Design a protein around this nucleic acid. Sequence first.
DNA 1: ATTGTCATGGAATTTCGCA
DNA 2: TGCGAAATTCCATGACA
DNA 3: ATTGTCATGGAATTTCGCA
DNA 4: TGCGAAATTCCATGACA
Lengths: 367, 367, 183, 183
Amino acid sequence: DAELDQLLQGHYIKGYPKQYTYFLEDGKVKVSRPEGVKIIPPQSDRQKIVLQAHNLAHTGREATLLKIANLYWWPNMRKDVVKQLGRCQQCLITNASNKASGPILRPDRPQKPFDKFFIDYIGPLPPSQGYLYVLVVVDGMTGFTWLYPTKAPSTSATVKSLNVLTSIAIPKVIHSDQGAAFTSSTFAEWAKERGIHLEFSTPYHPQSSGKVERKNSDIKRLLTKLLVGRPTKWYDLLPVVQLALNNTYSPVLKYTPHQLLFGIDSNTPFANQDTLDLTREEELSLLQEIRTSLYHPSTPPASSRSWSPVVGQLVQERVARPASLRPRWHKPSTVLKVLNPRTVVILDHLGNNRTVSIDNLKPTSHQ
Amino acid sequence: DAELDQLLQGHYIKGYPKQYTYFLEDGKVKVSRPEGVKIIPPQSDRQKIVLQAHNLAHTGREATLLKIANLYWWPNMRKDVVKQLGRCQQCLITNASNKASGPILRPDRPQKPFDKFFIDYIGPLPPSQGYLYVLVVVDGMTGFTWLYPTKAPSTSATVKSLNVLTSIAIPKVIHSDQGAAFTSSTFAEWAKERGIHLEFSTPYHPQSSGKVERKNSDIKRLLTKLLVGRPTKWYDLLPVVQLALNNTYSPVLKYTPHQLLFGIDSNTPFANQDTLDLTREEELSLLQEIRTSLYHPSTPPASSRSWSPVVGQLVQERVARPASLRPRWHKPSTVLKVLNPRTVVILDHLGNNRTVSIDNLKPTSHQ
Amino acid sequence: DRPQKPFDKFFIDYIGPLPPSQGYLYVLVVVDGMTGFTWLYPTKAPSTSATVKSLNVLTSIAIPKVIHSDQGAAFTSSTFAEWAKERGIHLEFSTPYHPQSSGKVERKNSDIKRLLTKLLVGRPTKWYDLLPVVQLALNNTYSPVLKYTPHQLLFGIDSNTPFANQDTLDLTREEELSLLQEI
Amino acid sequence: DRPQKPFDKFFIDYIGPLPPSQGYLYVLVVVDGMTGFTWLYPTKAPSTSATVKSLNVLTSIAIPKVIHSDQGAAFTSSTFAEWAKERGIHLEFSTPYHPQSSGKVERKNSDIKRLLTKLLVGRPTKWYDLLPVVQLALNNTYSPVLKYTPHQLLFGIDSNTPFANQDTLDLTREEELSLLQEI
DNA sequence: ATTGTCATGGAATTTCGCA
DNA sequence: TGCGAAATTCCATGACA
DNA sequence: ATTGTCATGGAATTTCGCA
DNA sequence: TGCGAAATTCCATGACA
Ligand SMILES: N=C1c2cccnc2N(O)C(=O)C1C(=O)NCc1ccc(F)cc1F
Ligand SMILES: N=C1c2cccnc2N(O)C(=O)C1C(=O)NCc1ccc(F)cc1F
Ligand SMILES: [Mg+2]
Ligand SMILES: [Mg+2]
Ligand SMILES: [Mg+2]
Ligand SMILES: [Mg+2]
Ligand SMILES: [Zn+2]
Ligand SMILES: [Zn+2]
């Protein structure tokens, strides 16, 4: 009343423009605007009005305002609408984002073979000799790949396979996703005994294991072709596929993974013979030159409406396995640390510290 | 021998450049090229060589050639490589496309309400009062939506629901996807009795039902918000959601679906009162003007490497539910007729005529 | 005064008891005062419960400012008054033993009674399935006073089911014989 | 003549019978002639079948131009000759009762025998689990003649497991007592 | 015999209130 | 005929199994 | 406490063979 | 110092649950 009382008798109040006539009718303050006659409610009623309008269908900014504007007018209406949108917990956790993640990082290729392994499971596949899964191990520098058939994606099967592989050489780092076989304490114990550092992808983000994921595509693609018009007896083909892909050229690199690992082809079909007259030491010198000069891609352009995380920003983590008719986002959390433009630590909805990809985050709307 | 015999003694043959010296060694014709000494095989051996190289890992153009080039050289090698790629059935049906579909059509909004209904099922949902599914019916012109809970996505439940809906008005056209409830002869019989033309999406392409699919998003989104912190008792909320969405403004249109259907708000909260002093005939005249002047989007720009179908072109249909380690594409088929830039008829792998979206097609590589 | 509009006033009344048709015995008739548009809902009883269930379906499509009815028990109950208050619907009652609405509505309720009677005879237990085609007929009937049908006044378009062949609506002499036989 | 290279010549031979270790009784030894790199495969018998199974694992990593062996039954069989022909592998045999390979390979096969013996004593049924660490030890052993280890010559890099603490390789006097006790 | 759609909230652009 | 702020329009983003 | 990847085949660009 | 054709490089597209 107090603010609107002075308006009726004729005095100026900031926010209310002077050129329109404000009057009283049916016990309510009104104003004649170009759209029509609108009611000016008192300051103390506006939060309730904005909420009643929003809660009809939990609409966003413009759709909520268009409801209010049918009856009411007051100064800076969208400011009060946006204030309620940022306080509505149901909208914040249910609505989708409309800001894309920032552009992807292209991390440096590991300098040497056995610097970093990328491991992952494929499966379940059709039963072949009692086996359902395939452990795939990809050397990061070379792309050289080892395949191991298993009956389950277990820690015990991972350890048995890697004991065979590590007969050739021990890696510095093994990178894996957060599958159960790789996160168990038995596997961490196995890695510490051998001086192997275990590196883990952020959760629910197979991009981060992209080296081995992309190899899984090639493995399945070749197996599919070899099994056309045949029963899917893939167990006997894993050695053939392993050898075939390890000796397949990458057109952008001009080398096979075998060549990047050994510096010379073995007795396979169409073996390259360019280094026949060189000694092995001369051959290994050319190999060190080839390894350092390989093509490496750069971060692509950001999309026109991307976001990058800032310390202290309110963000929301995606729900992992969201049930039917349940929100797709967790409640707002705060960015503690920015590890890189695509990776952050957050103070989670539970209270724990959690390391996540921004692909599984949205910035909370309306600040 | 015949062609290569004249080459050794010194005569010129087209394809073989003169400036290099061709010689015989170990019973094989050879040539000294900048890369090194390569073997020139006779014409009759080259198809076998290209096939042996390709079949190692069923590689594409450059990766296959890089194998051959280690040992051999002859004129226009990639031409013989591409010839074998287009004949390899396993590669054609297993490999992915690298050409995007042409840009989407934005078909005209139906001129009048009840010109075209879009119907579809949501579900299964969590059991609520014994009900698992929701039939969603969207009027194309207005966006006005009817919701009906069902126990199964059946023809019998569709008919019972639409008998209730068609008490208000009969539509000219009902558009649906090829789900079992809508393709059965019982449903076609029900539509012919009432003079309703049944229109069907191309298979496995819910884009084509995009009007009702997009409404399904809004229905589930609002239900999710209303059920936060509660058991998912969605049966009692369907009437509330129906009314809430039918009276929600579209920011780009500036109207609610209720307003586009009736031309005046009913006794709902925040009812628009701009046409209070008009008669109904004056109101309906303004409604006809509003319906014709609604915003309509246009076809977006084509991506830089899109394809559009041509009559007689070899194309391949996507496999619907492809089993593990089986090809993702059917064998090549021919485009009989181009219904629009995004829709074609093809002479199928079986022999039948089939109407499909180009989103479920790739152009066969290597002609 | 403001021109009359759709959803200003719904006129409701029960017809029945009718012969059983798939469990249902009565018909709740709802007529929009301005347009003459008719909604028909079958019910098992003329109760407040059955009225609230049927009108909850209608009011998920459109809510009237006023509902008008006679002083029937289902409409004068405190439960129905509470239902109407929750939705901002004013209830309006005619005087006991003096039912009044409007000429357009009176003649529409007349049409409904006689059209139901004419289709009841011959198949008196199968009127539940015919309620859709009854509504379409009623709502695509040409108005003598106004130029347009109820469908045209509500939606502002022509219908896809115009009823040009105007049914006679009176009973034929053979239909009077079979109607007089039972009850 | 062309300089010697990895995968030019694999030298294979069986060691055994050994005491049982998780079902296995023999060890197929494969040594690359140029690098000295060693692969060890446990087998249940010195048969062609067991040789083909173990070498199918190795030849899915790398195929030699030549395999060299003594005239053992498993290597002179027509099945093994057919296996080698399918993969383009030339087979090469030493004269009966006069086994010869190369100084580097002879000394490598010597190292393998003595390193296995030294780890066998004390735990003679648990050598299957130790075959990985045996290979790593052998393949990261400094070569006197050449400057580099087998790992360095095969991959062209330093290893993540250098064995700087060179094991004595001879048996201690206490290990001779426990070795002489059993057999 | 057929075809994407549109709510969302920051940003870009236009309009408003006043002079 | 021009300014600062508010109001409106623009439109990339993402999800409908 | 961490991060996309790369085979594919038309198109765009460069190199080759000859003059 | 320039032409037509071949060879090479470019790079958008799509799929790794
Ligand atoms: N969900 C997965 C998963 C879950 C639990 C354990 N392991 C998993 N692995 O290994 C996966 O590959 C998963 C997966 O979705 N892969 C598909 C995929 C999508 C996007 C992308 F950039 C790369 C990419 F491989
Ligand atoms: N697969 C579906 C389906 C299958 C059988 C029957 N009905 C189906 N319906 O109704 C679907 O909506 C399906 C579906 O995948 N929807 C997701 C989706 C993806 C892309 C898009 F542009 C729109 C869009 F709705
Ligand atoms: Mg995984
Ligand atoms: Mg994976
Ligand atoms: Mg469907
Ligand atoms: Mg759908
Ligand atoms: Zn909300
Ligand atoms: Zn192929």
